[PDB]
Structure 1
């Protein structure tokens, strides 16, 4: 049940009713492909051509794995975030696979089965998968060599996966995300998730959202040694599930004076996704880092700040004494809209045409200067200047919470007009300094 409240006083809107799925950790599995260490007619020539693609793929992956895997790591409020190393857990597992005897343990565990748990030498208990046995196919079906065309067809089919895995790694420098169906087919991933040491709620959540799991996973090319090709697939652990989440939408709140350039603006800067988490609130300032599936929101705690739950008071009383609510100030009174979950915020200033329309009937509301809001019931589009926005047509109730725009409480003569990483208190602090000198 999605709902939404718009706050006329602060030109912001909160969408409630979502359930969390937060990636809090990683699980590393080792996916393996067993390799073969190895007068012409037309059908044998096609076999030699496909066999050469196989050798080249192996040679290509071996040349690729002469270097340690790595990505590119750093050194509205997104600049406040820290800097992780996303594949550091997978790379550490991959580093263990280079120790002597380590690959042999995996090779031995997968001798009689395709699915095995192996505890590596450093105590890490990883699930191991043999997804393709090219050794057994090439040795039992191609080493006999003249032959037939159904072997040519079948060999192209079994080799194609190796060639595609190699292509993906070649244009991604050994590290891919999302994890394609060549790295792990849909059935392999589902059975991997089923055999995973996770709870029953996590298995259902991951199985019902495999496409999201793929986007939150990495495939890390690891080693080719002793006829074994191994890459680490690093899967999300969802350690926070089904807690309340809400999306804060903000838009500029300006005065609407007639004289151009005499207008002052403020904007709440704490927009993003918010999820209750372990007694605090996980705040994701760049809401584009989260993916929404029905009422479930998938985020990654690496792109979050951990905040006191009092941050929610900015939505009811931005002047509350318990949390210093974050705002920016400006003079730029430019018009724009923010499409919310259940409606649209319109910040209409100057001489801009701002309307809301219905498909069949056309314009049904003309906005006046200021910040205003329309629900998605009976509305299909919104227009701000030359920009047409379609609104979301999801079901749910909106509440318009009336209140005076807080920008009216500020005297333009002492208003600090270029504050970015600011708050209610910092702006009051600067006002009182300009007031002292006059």
Structure 2
């Protein structure tokens, strides 16, 4: 779409706008099931099937060993704390009630996909993706009560047993909870049909179908129960209750004075960088922008990694001194040079004797940054160098706008400025400055 950026010279920050939201807000719990079999002149083929049957016994013995265990799994320190799989573990706990697997075992008699009402009222979508009991009771039990010369029986059993062996492996090195959800746990044809039957909007169906590889990354596979010849595990799928609302990304870098004595210098950095998305009259703020996933101009975030802020937080980009929101800063003296590759350019904080440049593949250096905080758009720029570090800029097409302004750090007297404030605000600094002045 129309991706645009604004660099604010006054605050050493940039906003990339034009994105669309797809926020994980809820969970959908489904029960995936695998129908198991309960079973007990020696040539080579009977030996091979006993070897392949030993694996089936080993995997079943191991999954019972996992089922022994009740399932367990800048401003980010302000976030809350919650259990990601608490919604799926509660469903798993229900499946441990007597007759509850028997309800699923019974409802999955005439079909593979079914909606089952549990004792707690959760309407779950149950799946039978593999029937090993049918294969063992039809093709392998009569041939063992000890001679077969159809080698295709060995390969067919190897192929049919393979998915079970691998699902068991994934659960073994992951304490019974896996993420992302592999194609062994749930193939694409199973996932796409699971989406079509999901109690979601047609917009959410189209969104999840065109972005299945994100659904996998945001989903959990929880090993649940082995009981009554049934292997059941829970797949916890994302619900995107917020879709196509505006998102924007805020990039910040340190803003420092460039005086000759580096000990008479003070710094200032906006701490509110991350993803911002309009959401229900407020703004969902994602302080660790690494937890969000971007597909073109769509951004996938999980609300568990967010803060719900007033919409007035956006005024901090236009007027960081506005009275409506107390914009958050830090005053640690971070007089080292760095760069931040934005959506359509690069913020460069250049301090000291550092060589900071932006170059082109064939043309050469096209901008040399002086001390302070500056910005260059990706137009004609291929890389950015800061000291010995080379950064590649994004070659995405979009318009950058440079908002000239006086660096706000110049408005402060270094002799009273409270350096080393890990997390403060415009008002806390002003409060601390007025106190230190009254002592004079």
TM > 0.5 between the two?
A: yes
| Structure 2 spans left out of the alignment, 5+ residues | none
What is aligned with 1:335? 337
**1: distance between equivalents of 2:8 and 2:322?**
15
1:332-377, CA deviations, whole angstroms, 9 ceiling, x for partnerless residues? 3110000001100000000000000111112111111010000011
Residue correspondence of structure 1 range 167-206 to structure 2 within 5 A: 167-206=169-208
What is aligned with 1:23? 24
Residue 7, structure 1, aligned to residue 8, structure 2: yes
Q: Which runs of 4+ in 1 moved over 2 A?
A: none
- In 2, are the aligned partners of 1:261 and 1:331 still within 8 Å (CA)? no
Q: Post-superposition shift, 1:19?
A: 0.3
Residue 36, structure 1, aligned to residue 37, structure 2: yes
1:239-271, CA deviations, whole angstroms, 9 ceiling, x for partnerless residues? 000000000000000011111222110000000
Indicate the SS of the match to 1:248. strand
**2: distance between equivalents of 1:140 and 1:422?**
71
**2: distance between equivalents of 1:259 and 1:352?**
16
Q: 1:335 to 1:17 in 2, by over 3 A?
A: same
Q: Post-superposition shift, 1:152?
A: 1.0
1:376-433, CA deviations, whole angstroms, 9 ceiling, x for partnerless residues? 1110100000000001111111101100100000010000001111000000000001
| Structure 1 spans left out of the alignment, 5+ residues | none
1:148-183, CA deviations, whole angstroms, 9 ceiling, x for partnerless residues? 111111111111100000000000010011111100
Q: Post-superposition shift, 1:330?
A: 2.1
- In 1, are the aligned partners of 2:254 and 2:268 still within 8 Å (CA)? yes
- TM norm structure 2: 0.98
Q: Post-superposition shift, 1:121?
A: 1.1
1:184-207, CA deviations, whole angstroms, 9 ceiling, x for partnerless residues? 011101100111111100000001
- In 1, are the aligned partners of 2:344 and 2:394 still within 8 Å (CA)? yes
1:24-65, CA deviations, whole angstroms, 9 ceiling, x for partnerless residues? 110000000000111322222111111100000000000111
Q: Post-superposition shift, 1:224?
A: 0.2
Residue 123, structure 1, aligned to residue 121, structure 2: yes
Q: Post-superposition shift, 1:147?
A: 3.2
Residue correspondence of structure 1 range 37-436 to structure 2 within 5 A: 37-38=38-39, 39-71=41-73, 76-145=74-143, 146-436=148-438
**2: distance between equivalents of 1:336 and 1:183?**
43
1:122-167, CA deviations, whole angstroms, 9 ceiling, x for partnerless residues? 1110000001000001111111211311111111111110000000
Number of residue pairs the alignment of both structures matches: 434
- In 1, are the aligned partners of 2:344 and 2:396 still within 8 Å (CA)? yes
1:81-127, CA deviations, whole angstroms, 9 ceiling, x for partnerless residues? 00011111100000000100000010111111110000001111000
Q: Post-superposition shift, 1:331?
A: 2.2
- In 2, are the aligned partners of 1:348 and 1:368 still within 8 Å (CA)? yes
**2: distance between equivalents of 1:261 and 1:388?**
28
**2: distance between equivalents of 1:290 and 1:358?**
30
- In 2, are the aligned partners of 1:17 and 1:245 still within 8 Å (CA)? yes
Between 1:33-42 and 1:426-435, the stretch displaced more is: 33-42
Indicate the SS of the match to 1:205. helix
Indicate the SS of the match to 1:196. coil
**1: distance between equivalents of 2:394 and 2:112?**
46
**2: distance between equivalents of 1:89 and 1:46?**
42
**1: distance between equivalents of 2:244 and 2:405?**
33
**2: distance between equivalents of 1:70 and 1:21?**
28
**2: distance between equivalents of 1:330 and 1:167?**
48
**1: distance between equivalents of 2:107 and 2:17?**
49
**1: distance between equivalents of 2:425 and 2:59?**
57
- In 1, are the aligned partners of 2:254 and 2:334 still within 8 Å (CA)? no
**2: distance between equivalents of 1:136 and 1:279?**
54
